[PDB]
Amino acid sequence: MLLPTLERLLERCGRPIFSNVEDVRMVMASLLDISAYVDRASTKVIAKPLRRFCHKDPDTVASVMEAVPIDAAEPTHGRRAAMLLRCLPKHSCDEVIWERAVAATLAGLKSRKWDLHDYRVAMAHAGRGGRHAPALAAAAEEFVSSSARTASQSELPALLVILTSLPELKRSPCLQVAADRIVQLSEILSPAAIGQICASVNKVSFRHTAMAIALQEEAIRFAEESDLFSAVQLFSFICQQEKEAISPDAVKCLAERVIEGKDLDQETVSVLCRALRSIPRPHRPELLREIGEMMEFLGGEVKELLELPVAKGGLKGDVSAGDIQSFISKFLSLDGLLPADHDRPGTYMAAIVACVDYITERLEDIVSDENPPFSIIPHLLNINMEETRRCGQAIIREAAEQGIHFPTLQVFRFLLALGDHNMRDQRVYRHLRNEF
Amino acid sequence: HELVRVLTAFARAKIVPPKRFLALLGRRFAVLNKRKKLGSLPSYRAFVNLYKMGHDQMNTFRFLADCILETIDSNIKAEKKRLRLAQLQSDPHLLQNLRARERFKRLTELKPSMFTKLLLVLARFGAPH
């Protein structure tokens, strides 16, 4: 009957009200002890403040762990070993606590007495750092194996999320075993879980052709049952596969499903751009229509994101040069997909103009970064549009304005572009001559 | 010029800020030079300060040398264009030495000894002749 009072205290403890170090230590210890007797619905309610405290004061976490040891003989303790791994900061956490948590996780895996959801919550955050005990994955290579042949459709994501936690797991044969078990349950689909499977498996470049054929076999069902996130993850994983596995007709239904997604995170926009870029060349002539129709609204969405304020997920006050450069580079490589003579899908060039005017409104600061996106200059110049070459001219002119020293190969490439597109500016000419 | 004064104050303090701080200051010098051009003498002072405080990054030295040379060649081109416009419209040893020194100081905004030590520093760093 303590759920309302405890949840109220959890909500209130986020602010710095308690002014005593020992009070904070006791509150953290009590929260760690009591997190083992709540449901998953309240799990985040414990995690969000504690994590903040763990971000605020990682030093007291050692004393909290000393006050509350971890025992692997109780199922309820699983959340205890799952929350803390998320609570500890990825980079601003000391090594001692991380090693102790790693040892506790290894003990819990050896126990095999814990709940699968607890294993998910523990390992999905233990794989964030993976700094110590490289044998973990190898030990995990056995932990998954015991559950390799018993994981159901709703239990496969539990094992796979663990399987994609560490780089040392990128060569685990248990991934192939999981693919074989997916073959065992190919026809049986879970629209909410298949997206999680695709999101987990995209990290590893592994390709099992038969499983992908199975996933794209029932794209008629996925037209309605699959959600937008599941649709984009499945589409990326499918196109990433080999040419033989890809069914040209089947991939059309996923593309039609992803049409009209409205509010989409820019990360999934980048994922879709990479997905279009990772389609085999022989299949492109049969799917120009699909690339074009995806192009149409991808341009609109990126334009909206550029106009949208950064607060709601836009780039109005974008300062991350390394991020905008990657986003725009993927966007223009998506243009590179189409044939030169092929007429660009409508309302896409409007997004191109939006991109160029946004990149021209902020020019001094973009070049001012330690690594300015000079590499975006070829991407602009590969497009047969006057505005793109004009923007490249402006960028090189701004670079001349700073008088930034250039490596000789970059000077030669810029001179090659100068000769190729027959630009007529003089300041660029003088600076390039001086640099050469 | 405020950044130049800041660097001079740090040099007087005999305290070396982090390398990334000096790199940021040099990049701000590069950015701000368009709106307000930086003089040759402040450029020389900043060059001496940056060399003394162990700033390894050669890009700032390249930028400072470019800032000096652009002013020098602009002044030379200005005097040559004045002479060309004029022609289109149309102890003595000690005195000659003084006139040459005055002309050099007018063109370079710097004493000959400091110009020669700048050239020696550039030669030591391996710049092309």
Binding site: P407, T408, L409 | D56, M58, F125, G126
Partner: peptide
């Protein structure tokens, strides 16, 4: 030389002149 700043340049570039001064047979392949 500090002015090079870790840039081999033309002496360490990929130009045909630099690629034409070795006898390996190009068997393994880059």
């Amino acid at each position: 030389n500090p002015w090079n700043d870790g840039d081999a340049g033309w002496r360490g570039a990929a130009t045909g002149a630099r690629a034409n001064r070795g006898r390996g047979g190009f068997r393994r392949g880059r």
